[PDB]
């Protein structure tokens, strides 16, 4: 039997602290994204990019953060899109880095271990967060300003047509778990503090933090999902699938590296991918 005791009371306090900083660290939460995806709100009405003609009109009507009418952009839509993803990822690395610092105990870790946890955690977290902005038809982009269809992304020339499909495939399965931001906040915090990343030097303080987080997550799941036992175990197993898509995505990234002109990867992304998996 579960019981309300000082231990669980602190577990709830931790869960609320993560949620609060999770909301401050990340702009478009799953709660806001779901409302947009169903029109069940305002602001909203994102421009839908579903064919090449609507892509052109979308680039004109959407205010992409990486815009600037002065910069030179590729002539291929597939590369312009790839660049947008690069920009968003770089932003996500900073949002995730900020969120990590808000995790009780993280800043007091070996700074070089903090780097290793961020290095391996960002992309697993990116694909977790990316699912919040996905349904089976497409994906929210530009902080909800736009919506780009799944089939349009598949229609991009090789090898870019295969870039996002694995992510949609993962998101469908992952979103069936029906997690909310409160569950997500702890889950990604558990990911960042995987004490089994290669290269860690001071592993004990990491596993001690992750165990505290795994307790808070399990309590969160039981309290928040009465109609689904085993949610905790299913969720842990989804990290495994995340490490695989990150691996599958590194391989895809090498095809595009030795096939496209220069295809400059942002230096931050290069640090992350250098000597990864």
């Amino acid at each position: 039997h579960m019981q309300l005791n000082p231990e669980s009371a602190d577990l709830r306090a931790l869960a609320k602290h993560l949620y609060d900083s999770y909301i401050k660290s990340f702009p478009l939460t799953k709660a806001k994204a779901r409302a947009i995806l169903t029109g069940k709100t305002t602001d909203k009405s994102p421009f839908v990019i579903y064919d090449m003609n609507s892509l052109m009109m979308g680039e004109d009507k959407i205010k992409f953060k990486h815009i600037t009418p002065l910069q030179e952009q590729s002539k291929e839509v597939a590369i312009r899109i790839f660049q947008g993803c690069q920009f968003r990822s770089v932003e996500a690395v900073q949002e995730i880095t900020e969120y990590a610092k808000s995790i009780p105990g993280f800043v007091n870790l070996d700074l070089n271990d903090q780097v290793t946890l961020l290095k391996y955690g960002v992309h697993e977290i990116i694909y977790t967060m990316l699912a919040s902005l996905m349904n089976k038809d497409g994906v929210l982009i530009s902080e909800g300003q736009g919506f780009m269809t799944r089939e349009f992304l598949k229609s991009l020339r090789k090898p870019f047509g295969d870039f996002m499909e694995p992510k949609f495939e993962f998101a469908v399965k992952f979103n069936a778990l029906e997690l909310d931001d409160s569950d997500l906040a702890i889950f990604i915090a558990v990911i960042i503090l995987s004490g089994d990343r290669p290269g860690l030097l001071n592993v004990k303080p990491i596993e001690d933090i992750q165990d505290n987080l795994l307790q808070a997550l399990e309590l969160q799941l039981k309290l928040n999902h009465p109609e689904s036992s085993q949610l905790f175990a299913k969720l842990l197993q989804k990290m495994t699938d995340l490490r695989q898509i990150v691996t599958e995505h590194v391989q895809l990234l090498q095809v595009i590296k030795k096939t496209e002109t220069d295809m400059s990867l942002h230096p931050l992304l290069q640090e992350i991918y250098k000597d990864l998996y």
């Binding site: 690395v93 900073q94 880095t97 610092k101 700074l111 903090q114 780097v115 961020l118 290095k119 230096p267 931050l268 640090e271 992350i272």
Partner: peptide, 10 residues
């Protein structure tokens, strides 16, 4: 190293 990542942590 991961100079950028290091910078961000600081």
């Amino acid at each position: 190293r991961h100079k950028i990542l290091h910078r961000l942590l600081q």
